[PDB]
Structure 1
Amino acid sequence: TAPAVTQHAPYFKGTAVVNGEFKDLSLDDFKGKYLVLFFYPLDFTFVCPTEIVAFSDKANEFHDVNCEVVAVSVDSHFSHLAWINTPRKNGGLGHMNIALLSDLTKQISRDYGVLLEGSGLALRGLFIIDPNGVIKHLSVNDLPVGRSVEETLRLVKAFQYVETHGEVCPANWTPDSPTIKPSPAASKEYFQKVN
């Protein structure tokens, strides 16, 4: 139970804003589902809203592949709601298709290893978590650079492809792209094909 790949994700619990109303959210609530838990520093800032809207606009694609997406920061759930009720044109989020988790005690960010104690706020950490609570991917950016929603989805689709076909995913894999049977003899028909 640690924030590192192949380990169980640390237990978390906070009040979230889901679909415009307050709701409590636990790690247990996603047993059976994939989860993209992603941290951002602060509400009403600059990179953060662009990521949050980008994930919200693609949320249906994540939900279609049994994946929930929850954004997490250290602000109150009241700040989350206020930011939801701000229009995008004025730096706000608008109506949200993803959960917004309040980590007001900072303990979720601390346990996920992404809190800068001096500042009191999370780095841009993202965690892809499988149905059994195991971490499959993680990535952290420094504050001034936003994450790729397209790449996050590519990875979720990829981890699902290997578990339901038993072939591994090459670099730059997309759906319908060739894959490799992970035995030396059988891996050849891939290598032939692309060269």
Structure 2
Amino acid sequence: TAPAVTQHAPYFKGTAVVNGEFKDLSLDDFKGKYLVLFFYPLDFTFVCPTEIVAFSDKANEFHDVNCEVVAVSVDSHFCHLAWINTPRKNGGLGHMNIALLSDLTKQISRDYGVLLEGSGLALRGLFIIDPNGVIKHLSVNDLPVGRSVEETLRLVKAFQYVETHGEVCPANWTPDSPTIKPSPAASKEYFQKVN
């Protein structure tokens, strides 16, 4: 158990807002599914709502590939719900298709290595956890720059593609673009094709 690629994701538990109501979520609940776990500093700020709404709008595409999306901050679940009941025009979230997890103890942020102890808030950390609870990817941005939802989706599909086809995914790979058979002889097919 550690927040690094190839290791099992640290166990977490807390109260989330799912479908407008308070519900307990843990890492166990995502066994059998891909999980995108992402951390943002604070509710009612600036970059954070733009990421949350972009993930929620794209949520259907994650669910279609067996992937859940969970936003995490150090705020309370009550604050999370108030932010859902704020319209997007006024800096709010509106209706949500993803869970909003409250890390009120700050221990989830601590355990995933994203808590700024001095401030008491998480950096923009993101983790793609597989159905066996193993981390396949992680990314961290400093506070003023939002992440790419499109890139996160691309990555979830790439990992699923390698798992079910046994070919590897080139740089910039998108679905239906060429992949590589990972042995010296069979790889030649790919390299010849794109050059």
**TM range, smaller chain:** over 0.9
Aligned equivalent of 1:27: 27
Secondary structure (helix, strand or coil) at the match of 1:58 reads: helix
Q: Distance in 2 between matches of 1:144 and 1:165?
A: 38
Secondary structure (helix, strand or coil) at the match of 1:144 reads: coil
Measure how far apart 1:22 and its partner are. 0.2
**Percentage of pairs with the same residue:** 99
Aligned equivalent of 1:114: 114
**Mapping for residues 116-195 of structure 1, pairs under 5 Å:** 116-195=116-195
Secondary structure (helix, strand or coil) at the match of 1:35 reads: strand
Q: Distance in 2 between matches of 1:28 and 1:179?
A: 33
Q: Distance in 2 between matches of 1:19 and 1:157?
A: 26
Per-residue displacement from partner, 1:79-100 (whole Å, max 9, x unpaired)?
Answer: 0000000000000000000000
Measure how far apart 1:114 and its partner are. 0.1
Secondary structure (helix, strand or coil) at the match of 1:53 reads: helix
Measure how far apart 1:62 and its partner are. 0.1
Measure how far apart 1:190 and its partner are. 0.3
Q: Distance in 1 between matches of 2:45 and 2:159?
A: 32
Q: Distance in 2 between matches of 1:152 and 1:76?
A: 26
Q: Distance in 2 between matches of 1:29 and 1:179?
A: 33
Q: Distance in 2 between matches of 1:130 and 1:81?
A: 28
Measure how far apart 1:65 and its partner are. 0.1
Measure how far apart 1:155 and its partner are. 0.1
Q: Distance in 1 between matches of 2:170 and 2:43?
A: 37
Q: Distance in 2 between matches of 1:113 and 1:19?
A: 28
Secondary structure (helix, strand or coil) at the match of 1:185 reads: helix
Per-residue displacement from partner, 1:41-96 (whole Å, max 9, x unpaired)?
Answer: 00000000000000000000000000000000000000000000000000000000
Q: Distance in 2 between matches of 1:86 and 1:27?
A: 28
Q: Distance in 2 between matches of 1:172 and 1:66?
A: 22
Measure how far apart 1:25 and its partner are. 0.1
Q: Distance in 2 between matches of 1:153 and 1:32?
A: 18
Tell me the TM-score normalized by structure 2. 1.00
Q: Distance in 1 between matches of 2:117 and 2:43?
A: 18
Unaligned runs of 5+ in 1: none
Measure how far apart 1:134 and its partner are. 0.1
CA RMSD of aligned residues (A): 0.2
Per-residue displacement from partner, 1:96-137 (whole Å, max 9, x unpaired)?
Answer: 000000000000000000000000000000000000000000
Per-residue displacement from partner, 1:119-177 (whole Å, max 9, x unpaired)?
Answer: 00000000000000000000000000000000000000000000000000000000000
Unaligned runs of 5+ in 2: none
Q: Distance in 2 between matches of 1:20 and 1:48?
A: 19
Q: Number of aligned residue pairs: give it.
A: 195
Q: Distance in 1 between matches of 2:40 and 2:96?
A: 16
Measure how far apart 1:9 and its partner are. 0.1
Q: Distance in 2 between matches of 1:128 and 1:146?
A: 17
Q: Distance in 2 between matches of 1:80 and 1:163?
A: 35
